[PDB]
Amino acid sequence: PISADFSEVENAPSFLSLAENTDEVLKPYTGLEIQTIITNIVGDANPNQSRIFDQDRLRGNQYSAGGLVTQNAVSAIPFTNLIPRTIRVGNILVNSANRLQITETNVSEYYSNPIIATKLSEMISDQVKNNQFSTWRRDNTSLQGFNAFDIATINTAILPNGLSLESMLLKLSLLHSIKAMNVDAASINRSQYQVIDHNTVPTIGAPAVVGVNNSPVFGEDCGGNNPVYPFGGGTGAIAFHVTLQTVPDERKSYAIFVPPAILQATSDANEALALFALSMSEWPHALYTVTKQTTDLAGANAGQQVFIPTQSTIHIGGRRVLDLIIPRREIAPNPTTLVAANAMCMVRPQAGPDATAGAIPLAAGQLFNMNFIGAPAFEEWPMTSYLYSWAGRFDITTIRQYMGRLATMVGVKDAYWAAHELNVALSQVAPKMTTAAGGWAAQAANSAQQSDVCYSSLLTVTRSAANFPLANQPAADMRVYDTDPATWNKVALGLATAANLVPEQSMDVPFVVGDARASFWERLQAIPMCIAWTMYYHSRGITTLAWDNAYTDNTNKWLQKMVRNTFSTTQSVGTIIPARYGKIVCNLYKNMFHRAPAYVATSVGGKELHITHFERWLPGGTYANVYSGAGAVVNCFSPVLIPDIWCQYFTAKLPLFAGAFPPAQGQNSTKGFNSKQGLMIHRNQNNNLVAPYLEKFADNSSYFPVGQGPEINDMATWNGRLWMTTGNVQYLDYSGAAIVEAVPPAGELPVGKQIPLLAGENAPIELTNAATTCVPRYSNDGRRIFTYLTTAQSVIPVQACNRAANLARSCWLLSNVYAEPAVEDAFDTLTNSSFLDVAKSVAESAGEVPATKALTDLQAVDVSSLPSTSDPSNVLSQPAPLMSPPT
Amino acid sequence: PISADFSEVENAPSFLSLAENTDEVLKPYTGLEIQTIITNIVGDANPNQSRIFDQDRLRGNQYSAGGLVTQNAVSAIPFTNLIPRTIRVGNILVNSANRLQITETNVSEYYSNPIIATKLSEMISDQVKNNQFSTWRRDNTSLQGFNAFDIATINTAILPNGLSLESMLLKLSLLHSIKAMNVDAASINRSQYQVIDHNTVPTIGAPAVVGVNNSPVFGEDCGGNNPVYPFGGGTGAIAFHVTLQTVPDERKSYAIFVPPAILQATSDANEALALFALSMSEWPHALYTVTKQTTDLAGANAGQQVFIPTQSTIHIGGRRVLDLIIPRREIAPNPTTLVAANAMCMVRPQAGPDATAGAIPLAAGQLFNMNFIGAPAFEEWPMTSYLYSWAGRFDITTIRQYMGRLATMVGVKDAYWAAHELNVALSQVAPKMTTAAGGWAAQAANSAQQSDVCYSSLLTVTRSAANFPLANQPAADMRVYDTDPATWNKVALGLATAANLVPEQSMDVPFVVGDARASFWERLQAIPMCIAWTMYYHSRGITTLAWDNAYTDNTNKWLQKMVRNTFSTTQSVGTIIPARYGKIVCNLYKNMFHRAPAYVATSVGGKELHITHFERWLPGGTYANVYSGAGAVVNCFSPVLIPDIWCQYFTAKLPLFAGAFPPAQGQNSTKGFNSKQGLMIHRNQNNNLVAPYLEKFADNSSYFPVGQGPEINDMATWNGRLWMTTGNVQYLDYSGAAIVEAVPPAGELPVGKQIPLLAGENAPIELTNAATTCVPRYSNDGRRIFTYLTTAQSVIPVQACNRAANLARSCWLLSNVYAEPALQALGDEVEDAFDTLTNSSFLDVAKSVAES
Amino acid sequence: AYTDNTNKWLQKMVRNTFSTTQSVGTIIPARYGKIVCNLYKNMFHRAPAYVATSVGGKELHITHFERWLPGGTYANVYSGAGAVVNCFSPVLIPDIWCQ
Amino acid sequence: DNSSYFPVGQGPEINDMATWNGRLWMTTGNVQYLDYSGAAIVEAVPPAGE
Amino acid sequence: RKSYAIFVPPAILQATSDANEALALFALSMSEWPHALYTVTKQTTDLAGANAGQQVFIPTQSTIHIGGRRVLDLIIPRREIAPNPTTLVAANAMCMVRP
């Protein structure tokens, strides 16, 4: 919140107060929290009616330090998911000179909620045991038309991990994020196309066209009409089956049953099959492309401009070949001939409306010839082309309906919301800041600096070094959970369940799915993530070069622990453990925004720990820096990516060191802190250098002692900002010597990105659009960093710390409002009771059927011999169930 | 755990504390949680790859004694089951010159858990008493499909013994592990293909192909199409029957009944049948071969390459011939013609898909001609060829079906986990270490030394001496229980039950079986087993020559009792009595890992006891040693296979003498122990010889008294490691004269095996991959062994024991261990604010782990 | 509504008029279908046939009103000369029949 | 708040009498189906009066 | 195919005067539908009555698709107390009524 008087900044909460862990439960951050402030919309409304094409800026009056008032000043939204692939130069569209951004994931099995066999599987085992008294081969009922021997094999040897569903739901949310772009322009912000290319102006008159494998440069059309994997460079295989017996022996252990709860629609069922095939294979299967009509700043030149979505570049390794087992239409003997097999399909697979070339060409609408016993030749298709043909037909409303049918088998609300959080964390991206004196700056068009970019975590994104397909693989950026086919098979049929797998009474998905407003919201959810990470890095004074080398440094020992505990590299009792200091950022988010991040569970010996997206990053990336006006790098600062008005205008509570400078009000303007706060001024041998009041330990260190670093003090950081915010500071040593790190040209600070204005807008003035809170303190070689003024330049600021004088600073002219976290149809009121009881019954539906053990017992030869009597089912202990105990 | 500081090694537990009995029940230590220690690992240069093909290795940053940092250095996983039969030399595959490894086993009988009669049997014998079974008709049969006269005559047997299922399930699991190699190349880590042949690179493009009797050299083919058993040669015999009346005399006592439950176990009843037959006959029947495409280290010379699985060579059982009684689907009198017998059966037995030659050739899919009461001739098939036919069709998913069916019929949980333990203990295998001053070393290509290998038990494995079929004098390794046919038949037909015969759900079958990761998990389970043995052979200083001769040729009484008590002995009935000191090794396992080994029932005279794989080895073996470069045998050391980092980084707790050195250049860097604790130095300055602070002598200063050996003292062993880790140690006696044992070339210590690097990886530096903990103290002659330095070389280390100096050694920068600056400008002790913010949430984890 | 519209209300609307599957694969009856049944019984004072159904071991009924599948196409009308017109809500029969 | 566009997540309410008045306007000879501004709707319409 | 066999009770066979007709009716009742396309032919004439002729219609019931059981086995009652047949003539004589 913005301070109105110095009394408000002086009474702001300390940083340690906000990093305490909190116990209360909290609602999710939906992004409407920002929408109420930066837009007209007050209640639910048609996105097309609202023209949210023009709702993409912070706006407001600004006050200058000289006493003039600027009206209709603006600041751009920092994030976007679009990477320009053609760029404007000299008012003419031209191709990109820079290689594309890429992301890599770590994917592994981990323990989840403990799992248990259902009543129905106890039924199946009873059927086998009662059969054993006979000469007859029919062991058990064949569930949902699948072969009874297959139910017999699926119902055996369960894993103790539990099941996750995370990678699946990620692939589905990445694709939803990509197709969301395809709606009309009135519902997408202009700013999203010009976060990187600030010289282009998108036209409102046509919707953007999403396509596949089209890019002009660097071999980014991964085969074109003859598709191959963007990373592997190969091609997959996909084969369909009625029974497991036809699956080749080399890969019968990898097969996946396709549940018939999906495919229940009158239409779009073959499409549902293609989509389910997409959610369990490797991603990306192709490079998607957004194409939008755009024009020059004058609106003269016009053309189709090419963009690559970030979601289409992030790699999630999975299976390349796969085998799906289609539901049977009626219980029957397995087919021995082709016609018997084709006639027997519930949904018969076919190619989508888009022809492909190469070996095994696919015609649009082409049907598959089912595999069967005694078949002369095994049949299969390349998978990259099968996913290619349907790729242009997927859209948001169908993914919503699919996901809604999926909802009725298993819980998918929280899991999807978590995978969506991960989507937003890996996809929204901002360009690096430029230093300046004034309010705006940008790098040269079609330059390496223009396109260099960063995560909400202040880490730079790696680039490709060669033409697609990529011969080699980048270090992983983040670790996600995998979904095992075996336990998937057990759960899809009702043989097993766990607390995270329970169907939910809503029978419905998160609000973000199926909306045309989704891109705007995802763009707005990245903001809090950066606010929390920047508070994390700016609470301490380490410079970007020192982070950049911290992991291996042996100059200091504390810097190493500091780097090492910010990432996830610990495990215990077979499962993943969250980064030890990511919990601090998680704590900060809750205390500052009064909301709760989405989390998954991990079981450690049976105890549940929560893991948010903050705790799962991996070491190896480079930290964000800022460039000079000429494009030279600047190392001296703490990492930064966004201007601090975003931090301080969208919080309920903020640490004291980061607050805004208060408005002029008659005599009183700005104020500092002195020896009455326990601070002290630093002087050296040189009489023409002065540094502010600082912590008392600062007098007795020029190098930090090994095993120790700079402390949290909010007031000293405050005076550090007051010194920097004068236009003439020196970033120096205890003795007044130059530090090893590169420093900006004098008096400059990093500032936010420039975008073209609308009529009536003004550019931001002075330091009203700049990071300020990045006060350096820890040099790479272990020296302290000081901010010096000359004596004459020193007098007014020191008296201002003494509160005898006043400093003059610019501010936004804005008030504080932070909203509370917060529909029945007539038909819903008509049916509310029946919905209330049926929803309650579905929660226990599990593998349940009305028949009890007491009925089935009457049908048995011997009740005592039944495995259900001698082994009643229990939840599995972790990591392993007891085996061969000492009697 | 590795040590970040010397306070961590002062506070480590004593060996005696860890050898102490613990009473609580503990969980099994599966490879599914051992897996995560290799993945999820500190280090920033690491490209954290997902494929299990690449998660094959121990990666990490390292720190030199000179203060330099090394990124992403590598240590290989020591074990494998594959044995190369083609060897690359000169960048090309070349036929191997070395003979195949072999394993052998002895049977025992199982009096534990004697059976209890069902009500059914008791009423049948009751009817035999009140009648003469005269009520029954010629054609009466049960629903199962056997006639009543047979069940009645089987009922009449009285058995002392319980039922075991062990040898059965063991054969099933060995075959499982062989078939588990057939999955795609991404699913098996490549390090497994190059533990022996380290000049070879497996290709990720194609799956390994599993065949049989295709070996290049040494008669390995086993006669090809006509299959003869690899041990002893000759064919077996197999026959099928609807009644036991038709089985020939002198074989009637040995017949097995096949329950319909075996036949309905899988979609193809013939496959389930052959699987049962293989399960209850002698193993191996043939030699399976794994073929994998490989390429040159430069990638220049690709080709197919042959490997022989270790499971394929273990020898178990002896039942060359058998008779199977099969259910009749109709209620009929016993057959008199051939066609009646054919029509009569529940499913007629058939040959498998792959045809074979011989005096009795079998066409593919050929149908057996059933036996009947008229006997123009008895009819029969060769058994090795009958199994050669079905050998290709066995598959891990179907085995998962089969195990589920067995679990329903009788509980398979406990028994299968124990059998799996024996499978790991017998098949997993590591090469003997070579000595070096530096980080990496290996023996010459296609050398005999390249192929010497050992168990997790640190016993060297036997090698074949002649071409197959073998006619060897047997050299067995361990005892196993056998499954008895009559006790089988009493249970298959409802005539008896036991306490361990409780039926189970199919869901409870252990998750390893039928899973494609299992091979990988196998290797992992070998690592903790060794650690335990390693801590047993190191706490005492006995050298490898002394272990080679204690049982066969040494006049010292103490070694004799020592080698004698480490192994098991027979009872008057012939039952096992478990190894006395083996109980110590079990204890170690449970204190270092907080996990338990499988337990198996045993009896002495009618007294319950248990047995683990730790207590069932046979006395009379040869021990692990190491090779100098150029391959000369050296045997001064106590036996060793694996590097210290493996022992140190997987344990929850280790004894004090085995802790890792702290990083160089810190306050509280490596140190030693002195008089105040209780030690005393030996000096010999008249000859330039100084030795560390050691244990006070007890009339055993130069020769040990007959009937006594060196005492357990953790701190002297530690000081001996300090003297050793210095560059030029010298192993001499009390006078400073040469010991009888062969010694390493000066300065050398045994070190881990070399493997080819991935790009971006580094070879380990210094003694970071060395084994250090094996310090000699007791020689074959009975004299003490001393580690000496010269009077000048010995001056700093004495000051470090005396704690007035620090020493410098290399380390791994893992798991909370950080680098030390050369200055050390200490400040006031200061808890960091982030550590106080996160203290509780951190302790919660430890508590959750403590629960488990 | 079921295949291509970004309005949430039509989506829930077309969704609730039809039946959905249970984890076992059993029918869960259409939620708004119960309204249509009610209409039938108030306009005619006669009942449609009822059939037993279960959710987890809980009794329920089903009529032909609640067992249609989502994803269909609807009734429209033709101009003379046969051009499609679709401004109206769907219709087949004249008011006198309803009345 | 649904005078020209319905809010996302809401639709027209059940009101019998307005539907009645709409039938009255329709049963007159030349009804015209347009929007709030009096502009053409996207749906195809009957030839006038039909 | 042993797992899928249906037993035909004698009650189906004594259902009608011709047991084969009742048998075929049971078989049609438990196999896949339709097996064939029935056709209704009716004489018709012109609106002036000028042009009479036969005219073909296809019933809507004939085109609905239900079931999937292409193949089946029927177990039939034995009218005599006998052991299972070994020859053809024994099996023919044995049955309650031969199909």
Residue numbers in the entry:
A (entry chain B): 789 to 1610, 1618 to 1682
B (entry chain A): 789 to 1640
C (entry chain A): 1338 to 1436
D (entry chain A): 1487 to 1536
E (entry chain A): 1039 to 1137
From the publication, what sentences describe this entry?
Recently, several unassigned viruses isolated from mosquitoes, including the Omono River virus (OmRV), were identified as totivirus-like viruses, with features similar to those of the Totiviridae family. Here, we identified a new strain of OmRV and determined high-resolution structures for this virus using single-particle cryo-electron microscopy. Generally, members of Totiviridae and totivirus-like viruses have a non-segmented double-stranded RNA (dsRNA) genome containing two large overlapping open reading frames (ORFs), namely, ORF1 and ORF2, which encode the major capsid protein (MCP) and RNA-dependent RNA polymerase (RdRP), respectively.
The current resolution of the map for the full particle allows us to build ab initio atomic models of the MCPs. Each MCP-A is located close to the five-fold vertex, while MCP-B fills the vicinity of the three-fold axis. The ab initio models revealed that the first residue of the N-terminus of both MCP-A and MCP-B was clearly located at Pro789, which provides strong evidence for cleavage at CM-1 between residues Asn788 and Pro789 in OmRV. The C-terminal residues 1641–1685 of MCP-A are disordered. The MCP-B C-terminal residues 1618–1682 form a Ω-like arm structure composed of four loops and three α-helices. It extends along the interface between MCP A-B-A and interacts extensively with two neighbouring MCP-As. All these MCP A-B-A interactions strongly fasten the capsid decamer around the five-fold axis. However, in OmRV-LZ, the C-terminus of MCP-B, instead of N-terminus, play roles in stabilizing the capsid.
